[PDB]
């Protein structure tokens, strides 16, 4: 029961819960995209997109403030390295029992989740046939559904970001 | 700057 599994457990700390699931989703998505890289190439995906109605340009707001128009593999590389960095950052994601979560942690996590969604969107829009080819649709669908149930639970991604898969989300 | 460009 996913709706149940995403709720804030008995006397748990919100930040820790979100931190803990965010790490897991990154891993899920990394795995899933990892499986179809052979089919996501600079040739197939010249610009990063969620179908022709949505095109994404990479910026992290610090090192790169002016969005770069790039291919899907490149955009996702930018993205995955970027998320990794954050998760490895001890001021951001404390693994010790001494560092608290920064005052802005929620905003940090929301930003990671916002962008992780785009990998799902690109996969569903552009590579679902490959996903079926490799017989990983069940893995993809359950992962996405889990991801969405969690963000809906804590209102972590706003509707206009989710729009490229609104129809798919509605059928969850 | 806007990271997402929408088209119709
Ligand atoms: Zn692609």
Per-domain boundaries in chain A: 1-172
CA of A40 to the centre of ligand 1 (A): 4
What b/e readout covers A138-169, taking b as 16+ CB neighbours within 10 angstroms?
eebeebbbbbbbbbebbebbeeebbbbbeebb
Q: How far apart are CA A139 and CA A158, in angstroms?
A: 25
Query: Are A59 and B4 an interchain contact pair (Cβ–Cβ within 8 Å)?
Result: no
Give whole-number Cα distances, A60 to A17, A112, A125, A136, B2, in Å. 24, 10, 24, 30, 11
Q: How far apart are CA A114 and CA A86, in angstroms?
A: 14
The two tokens of residue A76 are: 């996702």
**Residue A11 region, left (φ>0) first, then alpha (ψ -120 to 50), else beta?**
left
Experimental method: X-ray
Query: Are B1 and A56 an interchain contact pair (Cβ–Cβ within 8 Å)?
Result: no
Give whole-number Cα distances, A84 to A27, A74, A132, A159, in Å. 10, 15, 28, 25
Q: Which residue of A has its CA nearest to B3?
A: A57
Q: Which of A26, A28, A32, A55 is nearest to A130 (CA)?
A: A32
Q: Which of A2, A25, A6 is nearest to A109 (CA)?
A: A25
Domain A1-172 top-level CATH class: mainly alpha
- Is residue A37 within 8 Å of residue A30, measured between CB atoms? no
Does A57 show up as a binding residue in the annotation? Answer: no
Alpha helices in chain A (DSSP H): 2-5, 14-36, 72-88, 105-133, 137-154, 159-162, 166-170
The two tokens of residue A92 are: 């951001």
Overall size of chain B counted in residues: 8
The two tokens of residue A97 are: 């029992």
Residue A116 CB coordination number (10 Å): 22
Torsion of CA A140, A84, A155, A69, to 10 degrees: -80
Resolution (A): 2.1
Give whole-number Cα distances, A4 to A54, A100, A141, in Å. 32, 27, 18
The two tokens of residue A13 are: 């700390």
Q: Which residue of B has its CA nearest to A56?
A: B4
Does A70 show up as a binding residue in the annotation? Answer: no
Q: Using CB atoms, pick whichever of B2, B3, B6 lies closest to residue A53.
A: B6
* DSSP code, position A171: T
Q: Which residue has the tokens 């699931």?
A: A21
Q: Which residue of A has its CA nearest to B5?
A: A55
Q: How far apart are CA A143 and CA A55, in angstroms?
A: 23
- Is residue A57 within 8 Å of residue A70, measured between CB atoms? yes
Sign of torsion over alpha carbons A35, A125, A140, A20: positive
For an interface test with B, which of A50, A58, A67 has the most B Cβ atoms less than 10 Å from its Cβ?
A: A67
Q: Which residue has the tokens 């949505």?
A: A54
Instruction: Supply the angle between the helices A72-88 and A105-133 in degrees, to the nearest 10.
Output: 140
């Amino acid at each position: 029961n996913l709706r149940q599994a995403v709720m804030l457990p008995e006397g748990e700390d919100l930040n820790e819960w979100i931190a803990v699931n965010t790490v897991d989703f990154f891993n899920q998505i990394n795995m899933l995209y990892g499986t179809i890289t052979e089919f996501c190439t600079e040739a197939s995906c010249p610009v990063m997109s969620a179908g022709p109605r949505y095109e994404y340009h990479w910026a992290d707001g610090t090192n790169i403030k002016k969005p770069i128009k790039c291919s899907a593999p490149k955009y996702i590389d930018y993205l995955m390295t970027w998320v990794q960095d954050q998760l490895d950052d001890e001021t951001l994601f404390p693994s010790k029992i001494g560092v608290p979560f920064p005052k802005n942690f929620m905003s940090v996590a929301k930003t990671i989740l916002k962008r992780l969604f785009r990998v799902y969107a690109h996969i569903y829009h552009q590579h679902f046939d490959s996903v079926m080819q490799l017989q990983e649709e069940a893995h993809l669908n359950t992962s996405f559904k889990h991801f969405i149930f969690f963000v809906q639970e804590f209102n972590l991604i706003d509707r206009r970001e989710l729009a490229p898969l609104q129809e798919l989300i509605e059928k969850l | 700057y806007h990271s997402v460009v929408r088209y119709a």
